[PDB]
Every structure is written in C-alpha cells, then in structure tokens.
C-alpha cells in the first residue's frame, strides 16, 4: 500500500464561530475584499497563525542564536518578498504585528481592482475569472493569487483579451453583424 | 522463498543509482557477474539514466546488441550486466571511454578517459593461491584469475592489468604512504595516503588515512584500494580528487 503522498488542510474552523464581533468582522472583510465565503478568511487566518506562531517561537529564543538568526531572516525575507512586510520593518516584532487584512490586499483580486483596471472589487473578480488579466507572460484566473512586488508591477490585460488588443467578443461581433445585415 | 529472487523493487534498489521513484514499479536487477549487486551499476542505468543516450530500455537493448558498447575491452549484450568500480566502458561510435569511479558523494561518476588510459586497469588483489599442477594465480575484485603472478604480489596489492592480454603490467604493494581510494563505508569515494594499519588478529583490520587537507579518518581494510603513490595516481581521478 504505497507510502502515502503528503497533503494538508489550508484552513481551520475558528474557536468560536458564532461570536457576534467575529461575524461582523468577517462581514467587513468579505465586503471590502469581495470574498466568496468565510473559507478564504479561515485559510488566511490559518496561514497568519502559523507564521506568527513561528515568529513568537523564534522570539522566545535568545538573540544571536544560529536558529533564531537563520529562520528569522528567512521568514522576514519571504514576508517582504510577498509584499506583506515593508522594507523598513524587517524585524520579527513587526512580523508579530501582521493582520489578515495585509494578506488580503496582497491578493491579486485587490490589485486588479486597485490599479484602475477595474472600478470595483466584484468587477475585478469577474475580470480575473474570465481570463482578462495577465501577470507578465501568464494569464491568471485565480483571484486568490498572492502577488509579489515584481509581479504587481507587471499586472496588465492579457494580449488575447478583447480589452488587451484582440478582436471583439462573440457578443460584439454578433451585434455588429446583425447591424450590418 | 524457496529459491533465488529474480525481481528488484525500485525502492529496494541501491540508493546511489538515483532511480526515479514514480517512473515504475521495478528497477533493473543486476545479473550475476564480476561485481556484487549493491556495488555494481547495470549497463541500462548508465546508458539511460546517466549518459541519456537511450530514452528507454528497449533502445538500450538495441544499442547493446549493435555491439557499440564494450565493457572492459569485450562486447557485452546483457542489459543488466553488472559493471562496477574501475570498469572501462568504450563507445567507439561516440569515441568515448569511461572509467567507473565513485565521486565524493559516493555515486558512480561519468569520468571520461583517454584511450591510452582506457587500455588498462587496476585490480586489488583479494587472493593469491596455487592452482592445479602447482600454478600460482591471483584473484581480484572482478573475478579475474591471472596465472603465473610475480611472487612479490600479495593480498591487498594492486596489479595493473592490460585489457587486450589480461596480464599484469606492474603492481603496487600495500604500505604506508601509498595513495588510496575508499570503496565502502561513509567515506566511500574519498582519497588519501595511508598512515598506519591497525592489525587485529581474528578481527577486521583498520587503516588510518590522511587526506591532502591533513584531515584523518579510519576505515576497514575491506574498503581500501591502493591506486598509486602519493601525488602519483596510476589513473585519472574525478573532479575534486576525492576531497571532503
């Protein structure tokens, strides 16, 4: 019976889902960032919890430790690369200060809304899911894509898109024809 | 089981082969031959997983019986022929000669050699004994029985064998200061000069070896192979010269 291939859950149910302020908070987060359901919020919270728990464990270690230095530097480098952590807050105490909202704007959906390609968060998700948006060479249809700084600088409409310079859509060409006939 | 096994699972195969785990369910079982299974690398793994000349085993089979591959100066047509340490593989069509020497990590390395170097081998002497009709002979790792050896040759010595004639060109006595290659243990692949031989009667002898970096280690005599004098190896060595 082949040795099992590793897999993991990307989210965990909160300790008390029904607490009123928690419901209001997830309502706010979803509406601000146009999330489909709470599952994305739980996934992001789980990721933040793991990261900040690692940061706390490292802080518990005495300074100048080889482990503290090595893994702390690695975590800070990853966090700044993903854009969550600013260049001038490259310290573990600031990693401890992160919030779910930060990862949320680091979602591609937020930037495609944000740069002016879309007027609104929901229109932005519609554009993403419809293959109208390209990172560099690559068309991305995943709203949850986490954008790097080099990556956010390269957001654009895809070449194949009708908005990116291609021919009009089936609807547009159909209406143009029926106007011609 | 009630007899010798005939199948080899991939996960059970020697780790140094670097066989891909998801490729299939079975790996080549090295056939009987000069070298032992765990210390041999079958020709298929060389011609496919190392040189990449062949894309599949059937290609390797065609290659072999086209007789372009010569192991040790002799044409071999077996896919799972157990080539091992110090073995010479010649591909005339590619004009290539390879000698099988483990790298520092312990894997057989693709070491290209010249034809003048490909013309011979080194063979560490395992046994020296008188055969029928009182004819002395020597037995090396690769199962070569060479008759009428020089009397000075003893066990643990290294005899330079010519491929065309299969005769001892020269020999090296096992002594302190000689240049040595490790063929087993955690130090497999390392190179260094002998310092001292610890002798334990009724037990495994231990040899101390010092590298070019002055670092010293200890290994069982069974994993010792004299390859020349210090600074004067009788073969071309792989990159890194067995350092670290």
């Amino acid at each position: 019976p082949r040795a099992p291939r590793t897999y993991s859950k990307t989210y965990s149910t909160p300790k008390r889902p029904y607490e009123s302020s928690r419901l209001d908070a997830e309502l706010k987060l979803a509406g601000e960032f146009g999330l489909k359901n709470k599952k994305e919020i739980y996934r992001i919270s789980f990721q933040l919890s793991k990261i900040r728990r690692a940061a706390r464990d490292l802080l518990t270690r005495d300074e100048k430790d080889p482990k503290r230095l090595f893994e702390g530097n690695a975590l800070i480098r990853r966090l700044v690369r993903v854009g969550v952590l600013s260049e001038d807050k490259k310290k573990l105490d600031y990693v401890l200060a992160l919030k779910v909202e930060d990862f949320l704007e680091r979602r591609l959906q937020t930037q495609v809304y944000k740069l002016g390609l879309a007027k609104s968060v929901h229109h932005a998700r519609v554009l993403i899911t419809q293959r109208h948006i390209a990172v560099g060479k690559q068309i991305v249809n995943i709203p949850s894509f986490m954008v790097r700084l080099d990556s956010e600088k390269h957001i654009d409409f895809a070449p194949t898109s009708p908005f990116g310079g291609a021919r009009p859509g089936r609807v547009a060409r159909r209406n143009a024809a029926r106007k011609a006939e | 089981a009630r007899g010798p096994k005939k199948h080899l699972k991939r996960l059970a195969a020697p780790h140094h082969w670097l066989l891909d785990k998801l490729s299939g369910c079975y790996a080549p079982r090295p056939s009987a031959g000069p070298h032992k299974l765990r210390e041999s690398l079958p020709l298929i793994v060389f011609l496919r997983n190392r040189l990449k000349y062949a894309l599949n085993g059937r290609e390797v089979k065609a290659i072999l019986m086209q007789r372009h591959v010569k192991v040790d100066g002799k044409v071999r047509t077996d896919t799972t022929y157990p080539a091992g340490f110090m073995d010479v593989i010649t591909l005339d069509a590619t004009n290539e000669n390879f000698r099988l020497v483990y790298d520092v990590k312990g894997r057989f390395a693709v070491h290209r050699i010249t034809d003048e170097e490909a013309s011979y081998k080194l063979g560490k002497v395992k046994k020296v004994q008188l055969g029928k009709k009182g004819v002395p002979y020597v037995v090396t790792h690769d199962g070569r029985t060479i008759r009428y050896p020089d009397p000075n040759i003893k066990v643990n010595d290294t005899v330079k064998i010519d491929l065309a004639s299969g005769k001892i060109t020269d020999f090296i006595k096992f002594d302190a200061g000689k240049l040595v290659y490790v063929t087993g243990g955690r130090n497999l692949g390392r190179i260094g000069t002998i310092v001292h031989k610890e002798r334990h009667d009724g037990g495994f002898d231990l040899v101390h070896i010092k590298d070019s970096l002055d670092n010293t280690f200890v290994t069982r005599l069974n994993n010792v192979f004299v390859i020349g004098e210090q600074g004067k190896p009788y073969i071309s060595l792989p990159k890194g010269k067995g350092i670290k």
């Binding site: - | 005339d92 069509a93 590619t94 004009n95 290539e96 034809d115």
Partner: protein, 341 residues
Amino acid sequence: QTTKSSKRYRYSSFKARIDDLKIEPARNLEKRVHDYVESSHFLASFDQWKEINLSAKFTEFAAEIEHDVQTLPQILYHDKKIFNSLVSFINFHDEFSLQPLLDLLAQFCHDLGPDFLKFYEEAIKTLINLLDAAIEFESSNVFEWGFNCLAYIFKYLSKFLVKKLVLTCDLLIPLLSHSKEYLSRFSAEALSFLVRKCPVSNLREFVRSVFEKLETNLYEGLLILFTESMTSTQETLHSKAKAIMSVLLHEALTKSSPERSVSLLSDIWMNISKYASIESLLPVYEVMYQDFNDSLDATNIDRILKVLTTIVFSESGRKIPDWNKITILIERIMSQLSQDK
C-alpha cells in the same frame, strides 16, 4: 534471401552487404547537406560532420583546418594544406573518422574542380590504398564511402577526366584487375559513369586502349564496365548505349584489334540482351546489322560470324526482332571461312 522472414531484425554477412551494394550515387534520392550552401560545399558538409561524427581523428582534423575553411577564397588560398591534411588523416585508415573525411574529399573537389586536377593523381592513389586497406578489415560501409568518394570526384571532374579517360583508368587498372570480384565490380561502375559521358570520338581512343590491354581479371572487369555503362534501368538501356556499342563493334571487327575483343563483345552482347527488353534492344539491334553489312569483308568474315552466332544463341530467337534479315546477312557472309563457325 528471396523470401524475407517476419523478423524485424536479420543478420547480414559482410559478403551479403557487398553483393547488395551498388556504386551509383545518383540513384540515392536522400536529401544531401551540400545541396544547401552559403559559402561552399566543403563548409556546408564540414559543419554538419562536426555535429554528427565525434571520432578522435576527425576531431584533430577539424581543429587543424577549421580556421582555413571559413570562406571559399580561404579554401582556394589554402587549398594545398587542406589536401595535405586531408590525405594525411585518410592514411590512418580509422573507420570511425573515415566517413566524414571521405565526404569532405569529394566536396573539396566540388569547391575547386579544375584546381583539383593537380590533386587528382594523389587523391586516387590514396583511395586505392584505402580500398586495398579496406580489405583486411571487413567493412561494407568503408567500401561504400570509398567508392562514392571516387564517384563524386568523377561527377565533379566529369568533363576533365573524359578527355583523358584512358589516363583515369590507368590509375584504376589494379582495382579492375584485382583478385576480388567486387572491387573490380565496384570500380567498373564508377568508370561506367565516365564512359557513359564520353564523346563518341574520345570513346574510340578509349575503346582501342583497353583492348590491347586484353591482348588477369581485366577481361572480366571490362565486361562488367561496358555492360554497366550500357544498362540504365530494368528491361531498358541507355540512350548513348547504341553509340558505345557502335564504337565497340568497329574496333572489334577491325583486324588490328585482338580476337579477345570480339569475344568480349559477344559477352557484352549477351549480358545486355538478357537484361534488356525487346523494344530497348531494337536501336541496339539496328546499329549492329548495318555495321556488319558495311564492314563485311573476307579478312573480318570470321569475326562477324562469331558475333552473329552469339546473336542467334542469345535468349534463343526471342530477343531477335527479324529473323529474315539475319538470313540475308548469313547469305552475304557465305557469298564472301571457318567451317566449324
């Protein structure tokens, strides 16, 4: 092996390959690298062979001459060293490097044809030694490379060798007269191309010259030469076929020529007759008869009779178009002998 087995793969002896081998580069329709040239034929093939062949001797050869073959003017200016380096590496007779080198020999001749004439003598002598050297190590491919290299040189120097076609074969007499049947067979085919391109005039200065040579294995090699020069495709004959035979008949009937020449002509006639159809043989038949009619004399009466016996016997009377006129020739022969004939 008329009936082929279901096996995808089948052993073939060296002799079997040699028998099937035929020296005729034109029939090979495979795409040739030297067709597509930017600078020269040599560079085009030379670049390809670096990619394919990894033989040692070819490796040093490429390094020695890579600088001097970049441009055609460079090749012409450095033609001497290119030939000297080329011949040197062939002499090693390393089969693994032969194929790239021999092809480059032909393309070298291709680049500077008229200029290769000064190299012509040395090049042929090198090939002769190689083909003789090819004997002790049996390798059909080496023979295939050797004779195609010769044929290519003939093709490129087709004009020049033709004017002095006698000189060309004088170099190649040892191969045509060699003990091995196949070397003479292969050597004859290369010459057959040159013979097939020879003007009727220059052919006579040839067709005479080989005949006094007849006066060991020269007779058999020459027989293969003319029949191969004559046969073109299955059940068909060459366009020049009539002109070659018309020349051959005149010297054969000429008294100065030895009787062995007439026997050769009989042997040639039978080989072409069995090979060729009725229709292809009509013009060949035609120019037989008038030559006999024109040259009928008492001195050459016996020679005419001998060839005529060959004509009637060859494939019985099936190949003969008209028997009546053969009677007319027979009547004229008597009116003008050897009783046995």
